[PDB]
Design a binder for this molecule. Structure first.
Ligand SMILES: CCOc1cccc(C(=N)N)c1
Ligand SMILES: CCOc1cccc(C(=N)N)c1
Length: 330
């Protein structure tokens, strides 16, 4: 089997991407935030505290003839930006882009934190990291990909995120028309539960490539590119007037600037992030200070290749017995 679904930016800055997901019978379609950095599929629901729902589409398990309470199971997750959610668990039929999993754990939110409530465009998260990170207790549950894997034509999914445009998540096949050149594959460590890999270095604009190992995660659920402070300082030094602002929480730059590209290495291959992908717009409405898309990881503890990096590539998440990642230009 295969599946293919379009993923769409939630706003004009590509702050996140939403993908329609069918849950239950008859289907209830919710727009979920596919996260390769977490491993829970959770949704706003008829169980969510009413004051914490503001415009999201909810899953109502009582209206699904295939829903079953997973008795005794609870879940609770944090996103590292201060947000979190928790609740109980059902199993139900879940389909993405024509690919159907029966008995998928659907984690129903009883509580969500404010930044969830405040974003009406995100109806929940669909985790695509390794199932060892799933938070369901006392019986850990498998991700949608883990449940689908054995049925797929090939045990892979691909992320093809658009810059200020829709893109595609495919399951079970590699669309050879969706990228240019060849795909370069690189080793993955699953020891922390992430799609963790080592970039071979970077360049800023037309500058020389610096060969240096940068361990990090391929994370569709993170908006920005978080890299070591040395690398980030080297990038922003090429933007007149850019500075790290403690009050804003990262590097900002004059909105009048033209940003240089940023290249990262995948083995001997190179992925080029155009400068425009690094512009996250005014820090507040009407400001002439703009927020940068490359930020220091110093306060996190791992480097994260978030959407800023991934949207510059066609990315293969190869879930074979020994997982690997592939990157191609597009
Ligand atoms: C406490 C949450 O910490 C992280 C770290 C890295 C990735 C993610 C994620 N969900 N994409 C979350
Ligand atoms: C790692 C993904 O972290 C997310 C994703 C989507 C939304 C939010 C939020 N704060 N409302 C956080």
């Amino acid at each position: 089997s295969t599946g293919s679904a379009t993923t769409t930016p939630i706003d004009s800055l590509d702050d996140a991407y939403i993908t329609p997901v069918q849950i239950g019978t008859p289907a209830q379609t919710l727009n979920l935030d596919f996260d390769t950095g977490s491993s829970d599929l959770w949704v706003f629901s008829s169980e969510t505290t009413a004051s914490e729902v503001d415009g999201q589409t909810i899953y109502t398990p009582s209206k699904s003839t295939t829903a079953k309470l997973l008795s005794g199971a609870t879940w609770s997750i944090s996103y590292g930006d201060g947000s979190s959610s928790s609740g109980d668990v059902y199993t139900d039929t879940v389909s993405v882009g024509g690919l159907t999993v029966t008995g998928q754990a659907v984690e129903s939110a009883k509580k969500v934190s404010s930044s969830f409530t405040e974003d009406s465009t995100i109806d929940g998260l669909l985790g695509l990291a390794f199932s060892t990170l799933n938070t369901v207790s006392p019986t850990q549950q498998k991700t949608f990909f883990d449940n689908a894997k054995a049925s797929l034509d090939s045990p892979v999914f691909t992320a093809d995120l658009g810059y200020h445009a829709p893109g595609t998540y495919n399951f079970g096949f590699i669309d050879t028309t969706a990228y240019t050149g060849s795909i370069t594959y690189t080793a993955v460590s699953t020891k922390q539960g992430f799609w963790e890999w080592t970039s071979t270095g970077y360049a800023v604009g037309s500058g020389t490539f610096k060969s240096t190992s940068i361990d990090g995660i391929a994370d569709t659920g993170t908006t920005l590119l978080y890299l070591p402070a040395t690398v980030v300082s080297a990038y922003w030094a090429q933007v007149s007037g850019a500075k790290s602002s403690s009050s804003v929480g990262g590097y900002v730059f004059p909105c009048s600037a033209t940003l240089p590209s940023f290249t990262f290495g995948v083995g001997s291959a190179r992925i080029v992030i155009p400068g425009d992908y690094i512009d996250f717009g005014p820090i507040s409405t009407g400001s002439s200070s703009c927020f940068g898309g490359i930020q220091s990881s110093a306060g996190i503890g791992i480097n994260i290749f978030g959407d800023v990096a991934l949207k510059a590539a066609f990315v293969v998440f190869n879930g074979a017995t020994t997982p690997t990642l592939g990157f191609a230009s597009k």
